[PDB]
């Protein structure tokens, strides 16, 4: 369920 | 086109 | 209850898991064969077209197999334009597998949409695309549309002639491409053009693998469009006489059997005589067995009267000598077909000089009785049952030989 880079 |  | 089953299957379709979606999709054909109600059929088919337009390609293959199974209810479909619009609308996808599946489904819908010009055009374009799996799916779809239409067939025969002369694609794809020409029995001029194409095809590709499918499609084409049966027969007799490939000669066997079984009255005296000369000049027992089976079928049919219709003695006719020598041949099946030919000709024709043939046939008959009586093989029992068919037919047709044949059967007892 991670769709992108974590900090941004 | 679909409509000229 | 039927409606209840319908929307619970719809909920299974709307479920998240493609396993359960596959479950409901493959569950439809049971509902079709349970409830033949047409509104239910139409709504179920519309939901099928929706899920086929948006499914994950395994649902698409499942829907395809559902249609191919429950094909028989297709004729009671109302919203044909919407169904075809969805199923055809998923053909613009870039996935070659999805395009292949969609084309197979159009081949399945051939029973209800045989005139769709856009379907014709999409099939013809994907016929010369490069992606392999969609090329063979396009071949299958053409094989169905050419069966239930005519103008599509003339378009495809022109395209196929162009491709085969145009030399692209390997021999396996040529094998897949040939059997489309079986469905050319819609008109005589299409039949003649395809016939010229097939003669050119066999003369252009002397290969066994080419020739076998070419001859088999050519003969199904003639047997359907029965206008060039004499040309077909004389071409096959040419290839049985001339071509030294044993497998090709066995093709000629198993094809002349089909022609003899379908259209016996078209068989002519010169055809019979040529086949008889070939059966004399052959060296091989198996091919002689096949030709003798063909002559047995033709003798059982009416064509024996054609061969012995005057306006050359019957003894001078080459059939009788071959029949006698093969009935007294060593091999059991050859002897069985020889005594079949003898029994058929004896019961059928009644000329003055045939009494010697009657005596020869009955004596070779107890020869077959002793051979099959003390052979004890499955094929031996088959030839035995053949001989007993000869007995029943001979005794019923001619009551003259009855006491002799009964006492011979008692000696065998």
């Amino acid at each position: 369920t991670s769709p992108s880079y974590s900090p941004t | 086109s679909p409509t000229s | 209850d039927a409606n209840s089953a319908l929307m619970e299957l719809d909920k299974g379709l709307r479920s998240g898991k493609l396993g359960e979606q596959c479950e409901a999709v493959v569950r439809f054909p049971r509902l079709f064969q349970k409830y033949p109600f047409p509104i239910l059929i139409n709504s179920a088919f519309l939901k099928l077209a929706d899920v086929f337009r948006v499914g994950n390609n395994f649902l698409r293959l499942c829907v395809l197999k559902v249609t191919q199974q429950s094909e028989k209810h297709l004729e009671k479909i109302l919203n044909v334009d919407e169904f075809v619009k969805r199923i055809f609308s998923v053909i613009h996808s870039n996935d070659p597998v999805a395009r292949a599946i969609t084309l197979r489904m159009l081949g399945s819908l051939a029973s209800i949409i045989p005139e769709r010009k856009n379907a014709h055009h999409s099939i013809r374009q994907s016929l010369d695309s490069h992606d392999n799996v969609e090329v063979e799916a396009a071949v299958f779809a053409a094989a169905n549309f050419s069966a239930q239409s005519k103008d599509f067939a003339v378009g495809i025969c022109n395209k196929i002639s162009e491709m085969i002369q145009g030399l692209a694609t390997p021999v396996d794809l040529k094998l897949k491409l040939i059997p489309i020409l079986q469905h050319m029995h819609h008109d005589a001029i299409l039949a003649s053009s395809a016939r010229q194409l097939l003669q050119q095809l066999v003369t252009s590709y002397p290969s066994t693998k080419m020739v076998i499918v070419s001859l088999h499609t050519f003969t199904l084409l003639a047997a359907s469009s029965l206008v060039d049966t004499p040309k077909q027969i004389q071409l096959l007799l040419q290839y049985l006489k001339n071509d030294p490939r044993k497998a090709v000669k066995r093709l000629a066997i198993q094809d002349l059997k089909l022609l003899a079984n379908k259209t016996p009255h078209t068989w002519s005296r010169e055809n019979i005589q040529a086949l008889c000369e070939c059966a004399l000049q052959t060296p091989y027992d198996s091919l002689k067995l096949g030709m003798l089976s063909v002559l047995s079928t033709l003798s059982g049919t009416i064509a024996i009267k054609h061969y012995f219709s005057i306006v050359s003695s019957p003894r001078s006719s080459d059939l009788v000598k071959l029949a006698q020598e093969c009935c007294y041949h060593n091999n059991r099946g050859i002897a069985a077909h020889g005594v079949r030919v003898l029994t058929n000709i004896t019961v059928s024709c009644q000329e003055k000089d045939l009494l010697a043939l009657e005596q020869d046939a009955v004596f070779g008959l107890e020869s077959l009785l002793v051979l099959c009586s003390q052979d004890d093989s499955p094929g031996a029992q088959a030839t035995l049952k053949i001989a007993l068919n000869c007995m029943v037919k001979l005794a019923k047709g001619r009551p003259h030989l009855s006491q002799s044949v009964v006492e011979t059967l008692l000696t065998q007892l």
Partner: protein, 433 residues
């Protein structure tokens, strides 16, 4: 299981709900069984040419045997034609009788891998392998992998679901031979789906947690992504040439199916970045790529210099291929981003960022002659700022004198790159009608 499912597919009418229940269960637990390509290859053609060909050549074909095949195929460099004879009759054989022949072909593909064999023999082996794949897939995969290991530990089924990159541990000869590479691609795709199923089963078993589902998602994503990366490195031409086209076509097909199955993987592969030598051929090959214009703004907004360079080059070749107004908006954004980085970058990273992305500018200018004056303004600005750097610190080759027309200093190389790309824009626009 697969063969029995095919028989149930045939005998659907008699069995009431069993076919439904079994096909649901396989679609629940064995997706690498219920992949689609094997089933369509099963569906085949009803041109009946296979059936007629079988019925009229199988006959008594002098009783070809696995031991005879083994003898001729161990003496294959002395005799290729007898082997090709035998496997011709084997392709004539059917799906059920092929099973005693599964041992020989797989375990002896090494001499096939040896150079000099004809690819008629290779494609015959490939078609027989498809048929054995539609009959008995799992042991076929095991023997194929354990015989395609390079010249030997013996992998097992559980080990292959654990680590499917072992499928990619094979010969560079396998990599450069076309149809065996197709066999490798099928095994790779199958074992990736199998790994998803096996981690599913192992996590549901080990429960005797939310971090465990997220760890499953992370491991699977990185897993197939690394598989994709290995496949692309295979597409890279080796140093030796400095067959390849067919290999690149097969890998492009497999990538196409993976991208259609999950476009998240396209996002992750493009965020990781792959060689830009591979970039244009993959652009030409993969058709389901133009989803990239959804996330190219994000990859531009990423803080890494290497990623921003990769995004700009990817956008360039996309705008060569498909010229959409969406792509034009993304290109305009990219040009303004490039101006911003020009405003903010120091000189060493200025070289390291502006050497690779200038053919991207000539790609932009080929795509969009509206987006043209912005390109020229940015080119003149990057030019004169690099010339000012050349002026700042002393040099030798002196582009200021060179005005009227190796391994040198970075700003020298950057000015030379800039004038070369201007030359390319002009020659392009002259010849381009």
């Amino acid at each position: 299981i697969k063969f029995l499912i095919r028989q149930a597919q045939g005998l659907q009418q008699e069995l009431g709900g069993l076919h439904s229940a079994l096909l649901r269960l396989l679609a629940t637990n064995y997706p690498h069984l219920c992949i689609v390509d094997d089933w369509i290859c099963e569906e085949e053609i009803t041109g009946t040419d296979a059936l007629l060909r079988r019925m009229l050549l199988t006959n008594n074909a002098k009783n070809h045997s696995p031991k005879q095949l083994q003898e001729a195929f161990s003496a294959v460099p002395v005799n290729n034609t007898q082997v090709m004879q035998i496997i011709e009759h084997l392709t004539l054989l059917s799906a059920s009788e092929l099973i005693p022949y599964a041992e020989v072909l797989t375990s002896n593909m090494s001499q096939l891998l040896n150079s000099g064999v004809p690819r008629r023999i290779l494609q015959t082996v490939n078609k027989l392998w498809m048929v054995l794949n539609t009959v008995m897939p799992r042991r076929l995969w095991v023997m194929t992998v354990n015989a395609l290991q390079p010249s030997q530990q013996k992998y097992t089924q559980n080990d292959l679901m654990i680590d499917p990159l072992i499928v990619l541990r094979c010969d560079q000869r396998v990599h450069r031979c076309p149809p065996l590479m197709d066999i490798t691609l099928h095994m790779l795709n199958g074992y990736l789906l199998a790994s998803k199923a096996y981690l599913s089963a192992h996590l549901k078993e080990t429960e005797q947690e939310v971090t465990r589902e997220e760890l499953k998602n992370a491991l699977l994503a990185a897993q197939d992504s690394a598989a994709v990366q290995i496949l692309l490195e295979i597409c890279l031409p080796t140093e030796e040439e400095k067959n390849l086209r067919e290999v690149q076509c097969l890998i492009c097909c497999l990538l196409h199916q993976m991208y259609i199955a999950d476009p998240n993987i396209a996002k992750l592969v493009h965020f990781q970045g792959y060689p830009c030598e591979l970039l244009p051929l993959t652009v030409a090959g993969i058709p389901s790529m133009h989803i990239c214009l959804d996330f190219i703004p994000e990859l531009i907004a990423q803080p890494e210099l290497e990623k921003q360079i990769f995004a700009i080059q990817l956008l360039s070749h996309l705008c060569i291929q498909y010229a959409l107004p969406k792509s034009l908006s993304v290109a305009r954004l990219a040009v303004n981003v490039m101006g911003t980085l020009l405003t903010v970058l120091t000189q060493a990273k200025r070289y390291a960022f502006f050497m690779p992305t200038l053919p991207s500018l000539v790609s932009f200018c080929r795509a969009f002659p509206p987006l043209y004056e912005d390109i020229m303004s940015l080119l003149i600005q990057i030019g004169q700022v690099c010339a000012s750097d050349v002026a700042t610190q002393t040099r030798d080759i002196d582009p200021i004198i060179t005005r009227l027309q190796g391994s040198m200093d970075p700003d020298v190389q950057l000015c030379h790159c800039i004038e070369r790309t201007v030359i390319e824009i002009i020659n392009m626009s002259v010849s381009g009608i």
